[PDB]
Amino acid sequence: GPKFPRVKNWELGSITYDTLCAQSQQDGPCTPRRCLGSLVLPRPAEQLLSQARDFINQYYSSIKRSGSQAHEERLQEVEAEVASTGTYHLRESELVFGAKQAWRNAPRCVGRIQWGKLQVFDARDCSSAQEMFTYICNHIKYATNRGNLRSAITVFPQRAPGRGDFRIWNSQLVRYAGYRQQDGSVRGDPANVEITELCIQHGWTPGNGRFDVLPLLLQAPDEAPELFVLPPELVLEVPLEHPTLEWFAALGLRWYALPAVSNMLLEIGGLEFSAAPFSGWYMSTEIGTRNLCDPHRYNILEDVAVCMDLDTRTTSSLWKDKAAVEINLAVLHSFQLAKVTIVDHHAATVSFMKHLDNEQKARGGCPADWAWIVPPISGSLTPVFHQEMVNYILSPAFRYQPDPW
Amino acid sequence: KFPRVKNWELGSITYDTLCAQSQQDGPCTPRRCLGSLVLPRPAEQLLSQARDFINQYYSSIKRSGSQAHEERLQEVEAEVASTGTYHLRESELVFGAKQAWRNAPRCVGRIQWGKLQVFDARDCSSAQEMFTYICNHIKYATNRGNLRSAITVFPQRAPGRGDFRIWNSQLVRYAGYRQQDGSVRGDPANVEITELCIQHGWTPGNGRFDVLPLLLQAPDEAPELFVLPPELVLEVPLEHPTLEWFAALGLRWYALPAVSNMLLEIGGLEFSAAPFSGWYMSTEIGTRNLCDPHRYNILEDVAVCMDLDTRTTSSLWKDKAAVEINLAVLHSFQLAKVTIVDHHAATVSFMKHLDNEQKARGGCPADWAWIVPPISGSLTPVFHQEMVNYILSPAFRYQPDPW
Numbered sequence A: 001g002p003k004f005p006r007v008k009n010w011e012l013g014s015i016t017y018d019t020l021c022a023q024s025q026q027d028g029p030c031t032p033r034r035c036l037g038s039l040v041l042p043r044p045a046e047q048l049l050s051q052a053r054d055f056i057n058q059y060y061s062s063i064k065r066s067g068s069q070a071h072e073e074r075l076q077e078v079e080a081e082v083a084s085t086g087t088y089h090l091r092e093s094e095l096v097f098g099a100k101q102a103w104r105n106a107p108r109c110v111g112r113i114q115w116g117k118l119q120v121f122d123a124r125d126c127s128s129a130q131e132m133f134t135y136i137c138n139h140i141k142y143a144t145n146r147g148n149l150r151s152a153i154t155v156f157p158q159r160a161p162g163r164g165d166f167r168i169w170n171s172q173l174v175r176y177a178g179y180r181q182q183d184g185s186v187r188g189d190p191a192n193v194e195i196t197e198l199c200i201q202h203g204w205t206p207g208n209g210r211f212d213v214l215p216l217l218l219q220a221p222d223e224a225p226e227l228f229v230l231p232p233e234l235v236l237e238v239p240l241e242h243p244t245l246e247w248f249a250a251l252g253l254r255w256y257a258l259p260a261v262s263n264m265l266l267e268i269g270g271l272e273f274s275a276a277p278f279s280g281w282y283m284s285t286e287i288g289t290r291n292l293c294d295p296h297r298y299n300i301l302e303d304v305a306v307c308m309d310l311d312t313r314t315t316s317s318l319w320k321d322k323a324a325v326e327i328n329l330a331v332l333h334s335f336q337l338a339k340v341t342i343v344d345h346h347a348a349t350v351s352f353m354k355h356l357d358n359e360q361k362a363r364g365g366c367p368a369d370w371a372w373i374v375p376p377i378s379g380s381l382t383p384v385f386h387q388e389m390v391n392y393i394l395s396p397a398f399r400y401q402p403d404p405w
Numbered sequence B: 001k002f003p004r005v006k007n008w009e010l011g012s013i014t015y016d017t018l019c020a021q022s023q024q025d026g027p028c029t030p031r032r033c034l035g036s037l038v039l040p041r042p043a044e045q046l047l048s049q050a051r052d053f054i055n056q057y058y059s060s061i062k063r064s065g066s067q068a069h070e071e072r073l074q075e076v077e078a079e080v081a082s083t084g085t086y087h088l089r090e091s092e093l094v095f096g097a098k099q100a101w102r103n104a105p106r107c108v109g110r111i112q113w114g115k116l117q118v119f120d121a122r123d124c125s126s127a128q129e130m131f132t133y134i135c136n137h138i139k140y141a142t143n144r145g146n147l148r149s150a151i152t153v154f155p156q157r158a159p160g161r162g163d164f165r166i167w168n169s170q171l172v173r174y175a176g177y178r179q180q181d182g183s184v185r186g187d188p189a190n191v192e193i194t195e196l197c198i199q200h201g202w203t204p205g206n207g208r209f210d211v212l213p214l215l216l217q218a219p220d221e222a223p224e225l226f227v228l229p230p231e232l233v234l235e236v237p238l239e240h241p242t243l244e245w246f247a248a249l250g251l252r253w254y255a256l257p258a259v260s261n262m263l264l265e266i267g268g269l270e271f272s273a274a275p276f277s278g279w280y281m282s283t284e285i286g287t288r289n290l291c292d293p294h295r296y297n298i299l300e301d302v303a304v305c306m307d308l309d310t311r312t313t314s315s316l317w318k319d320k321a322a323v324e325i326n327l328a329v330l331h332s333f334q335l336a337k338v339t340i341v342d343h344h345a346a347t348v349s350f351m352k353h354l355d356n357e358q359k360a361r362g363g364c365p366a367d368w369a370w371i372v373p374p375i376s377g378s379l380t381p382v383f384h385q386e387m388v389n390y391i392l393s394p395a396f397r398y399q400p401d402p403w
């Protein structure tokens, strides 16, 4: 009967219909002729004003004052401001709500059960690269909280007509260096070769290890980026050991505690926050499966399998699968021992199922990107594998943006 | 526009041009993607699908434009104009069935697409005849463990009448018997078909691995029950290479995956009974059939036999057990000399297939959620490969249950 996508869970046999998707104001990449759901990156006064009104309407609905006089007065305030200045500005509580709503709207995040619990640091007063650095250190200190991690976002000033952007050049606040070698290989994280080379071009004295923490390149409006070294005491890392395989610690592998995305755009009511880094805590598979075992990342599967004495000469020994499991276990064990927050892919996906049920009742749906939500090991052992998902774009949102260089 | 398709492991980029030949809408729209959903929510038309298919065929043998090509289009046209339908030549049927497989977005085994034995069963007028054909298919496809891909094609749908159908979802399936206390004994996915077999006269067993009889249906007739001779049905007892207690679980699985509920569409003609088979990829058995919570659900038993700490997700007890079961499946198929492919070799060969199809057709329709295996996803190259999903014809399609 219902004219909304029907969504089925094949493990439980239950059905829902997503009505939320009708609030999408904006096309993804798919069409009736071809699905592009698996692509990572497929590619103004009245326009602004209607984005702004929709957002203000969301905020007033969220505080149950929709249609109220404070609501119609805010709408007028906003149009008046666009009328005379081309842009407008958010009230503090509007920013807080919009930030949370952007996380809650992110289809690619499995951690969204935590969406209501986000510390929002307003850094819209920031006026220099040096001040960005202070805010960022404060953020990292707050978020890290000695291992007991707290979700957080710091919001720097919005894009402004004619004037340059605030940008953090690094893709995350904490990243490891990647040094291109003479034999064409890479030492450290190959994902970070470009930003590494950029840091060196901007005067950084590079180290030569596999786990060198990168410095930050921070750009304030209409200035060249400036370089800032994080005090090592601020950057919590966990050395990786394995609970029974005693040789595993001898590998010198490690990972940083804080996953802090710094190159995304936070869009709220048409306003564009080009620097707005946000952080949570890790799901174990991000470290132990992707960052450590992708062939284009640290690529350690074969070395670990050799240490475990597996038959790496044939696919059918399942040597990759066994090594990857042990690496994931080491990641979980080591984070637990160090009392640094982490969540395994089972607990995370169970919690995401609870999130979907919360959001079914609250908004009638939840946009979700199945390829990104299902973990990269043990897929069908998690309940999200058996759950259909509808993917669409809502605002507020975190959006990709081109690299500043 | 032609979508850009990137491999994130290798940095390489292609453009799918083949998607332009899609004539048939999927579930997605610009407002929302529905690609993770399993199921979807006259004469001129048949004639254009017919012409298009005859063109694909004459081009496939290089004789595009020839006398033979024109006379064949006119035959198709003369037949439709007079009867509202037409019939395929055996050689066309063979081509169309291979193309349907080639085109199947959810199949990771398509490197094999050109090697397909096709039995024409269009001269079949009875459920009894269907049974004989099915036994021959099984015997041939199984080949004493050296499995060979095959399809048998029964008579097409016709406006005047009921369809030929095989009620079972595969030719070989294990019974699931509901217990008065809710539980299922056997394969919970086959409870309905098991019950249908019982009501049409089957004497049920009571094991966890009882091979079902087939319900075959000729048009507008009640379906009929046929027991497969047990020697036709190759099974593999599961054991583990190092864990001796694993064989004590009494697990086993059948060699032959042979889908028998899907519709084969070729040039607008529809073949409601057209069972097809290949060989398994180990994860289908090891991960989905044995470990899915709504299938035989054995993860916990295995974890306990391995003495794992089951009380917390963070021991990765599930992951550890799933890996041993998959290992047991590969080992036991290898020991019994029955064809199987593991998920690494299979996905490596699919990458090769993508590359072949890029050169041959300018693209390949693929359903990423079904191509990427259910364990160790990102350990396989297909995880890192962007894919474009779309429907080309000839095609295998879902159809309603006949009851």
Ligand code: HEM
Pocket (backbone or CB within 6 Å): A103, A106, A108, A109, A110, A111, A112, A114, A118, A151, A152, A153, A278, A279, A280, A281, A282, A283, A286, A343, A348, A372, A398
């Ligand atoms: C609280 C713990 C959190 C967990 C466990 C978590 C987990 C994850 C995971 C596993 C991913 C996929 C990452 C990848 O494969 O590259 C992700 C993506 C994402 N999460 Fe979270 N998340 C958390 C908190 C946050 C917070 C606080 C925000 C924003 C306020 C957020 C926004 C995002 C976004 C935008 C993405 C997509 C990134 C992209 O497309 O590249 N998440 N989350």
Ligand code: HEM
Pocket (backbone or CB within 6 Å): B101, B104, B106, B107, B108, B109, B110, B112, B116, B149, B150, B151, B276, B277, B278, B279, B280, B281, B284, B341, B346, B370, B396
């Ligand atoms: C030769 C070895 C073959 C292998 C290893 C293979 C592998 C697979 C696998 C793993 C799937 C996913 C199945 C599932 O999760 O339920 C699949 C689906 C499928 N394959 Fe194959 N395949 C093979 C041969 C064939 C042949 C011969 C045909 C047809 C002539 C075929 C047509 C299909 C179709 C239509 C699907 C989709 C089924 C559905 O939507 O439920 N494949 N294949």
Ligand SMILES: Cc1cc(N)nc(COC[C@H](CN)OCc2cc(C)cc(N)n2)c1
Pocket (backbone or CB within 6 Å): A171, A172, A259, A260, A261, A263, A278, A279, A280, A281, A282, A283, A286, A400
């Ligand atoms: C290729 C690439 C693109 C892009 N936008 N970002 C990166 C690296 O950013 C890290 C990655 C983004 N998918 O996010 C990891 C993450 C973030 C958060 C907030 C929590 C968490 N557990 N995990 C690489």
Ligand SMILES: Cc1cc(N)nc(COC[C@H](CN)OCc2cc(C)cc(N)n2)c1
Pocket (backbone or CB within 6 Å): B169, B170, B257, B258, B259, B261, B262, B276, B277, B278, B279, B280, B281, B284
């Ligand atoms: C729910 C359902 C639908 C349907 N069409 N078939 C089934 C049972 O068949 C399972 C599956 C098709 N989804 O077959 C697996 C398979 C088929 C083939 C030809 C090869 C292979 N390795 N594996 C269940």
Ligand SMILES: C[C@H](O)[C@H](O)[C@H]1CNc2nc(N)[nH]c(=O)c2N1
Pocket (backbone or CB within 6 Å): A038, A039, A040, A371, A372, A373, B008, B383, B384, B385, B386, B387
């Ligand atoms: C091609 C494919 O879309 C790509 O490799 C995706 C798949 N799923 C993912 N899922 C997560 N969580 N993170 C990723 O980087 C990716 N990569």
Ligand SMILES: C[C@H](O)[C@H](O)[C@H]1CNc2nc(N)[nH]c(=O)c2N1
Pocket (backbone or CB within 6 Å): A010, A385, A386, A387, A388, A389, B036, B037, B038, B369, B370, B371
């Ligand atoms: C909802 C989701 O699409 C569903 O669980 C799919 C996922 N991928 C799959 N992939 C294969 N090969 N077979 C399946 O049954 C499924 N199930």
Ligand SMILES: [Zn+2]
Pocket (backbone or CB within 6 Å): A030, A031, A034, A035, A036, A037, B028, B029, B032, B033, B034, B035
């Ligand atoms: Zn789609």
